[PDB]
Amino acid sequence: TIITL
Amino acid sequence: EFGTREFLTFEVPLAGLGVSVKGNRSKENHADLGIFVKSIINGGAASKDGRLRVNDQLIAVNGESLLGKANQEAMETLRRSMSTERGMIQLIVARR
């Protein structure tokens, strides 16, 4: 649910 | 808890942006509300650049819009658009 770009 | 937001744009020089994002949803209204900046990794590209702000809503990346998309589809669009990226990311955000 949390993505790092 | 979105408020009245203005659309802003800036250019972020460039692993990656060093930004964590999350979808927001209202359960009472069963509605996705968009993708929001949850944290900016100290010392990453967005951190060094300084113009992105926690709780910004992400609107577009290099002209690819996240609007009109459920949170899952918008997240996929974000990942895909960042997968091809020295460089420059043009961001459109909505800020309270």
Numbering used by the authors:
A (entry chain A): 86 to 90
B (entry chain L): 5 to 18, 24 to 94, 98 to 108
List sentences quoted exactly from the publication behind this structure:
Among them, the Par (partitioning defective) complex, the first set of genes identified in polarization of Caenorhabditis elegans embryos during development, are evolutionarily conserved master polarity determinants from worms to mammals. The Par complex plays indispensable roles in diverse polarity-related contexts, such as asymmetric cell division (ACD), establishment of apical–basal polarity in epithelial cells, oriented cell migration, and neuronal polarization. Mammalian Par3 PDZ3 specifically recognizes Par6 PBM, and the Par3/Par6 interaction can be significantly enhanced by Par3 NTD and Par6 PB1 through their oligomerization.
The sidechain of I(−2) from Par6β PBM inserts into a shallow hydrophobic pocket formed by the αB–βB groove of Par3 PDZ3. In line with the structure, the G600,602 A mutation of Par3 PDZ3 dramatically weakened the PDZ3–PBM interaction ~20-fold. Overall, Par3N specifically binds to Par6β via the PDZ3–PBM recognition, and both Par3 NTD and Par6β PB1 enhance the interaction likely through oligomerization-induced avidity increase. We then constructed a Par6α chimera mutant, with its PBM replaced by the Par6β PBM, and the puncta formation property was gained in cells co-expressed with Par3N and the Par6α chimera, further demonstrating the critical role of PBM–PDZ3 recognition in promoting puncta formation of Par3N in living cells. Par6β promotes Par3N LLPS, relying on the specific interaction between Par3 PDZ3 and Par6β PBM, as well as the high valency of both proteins.
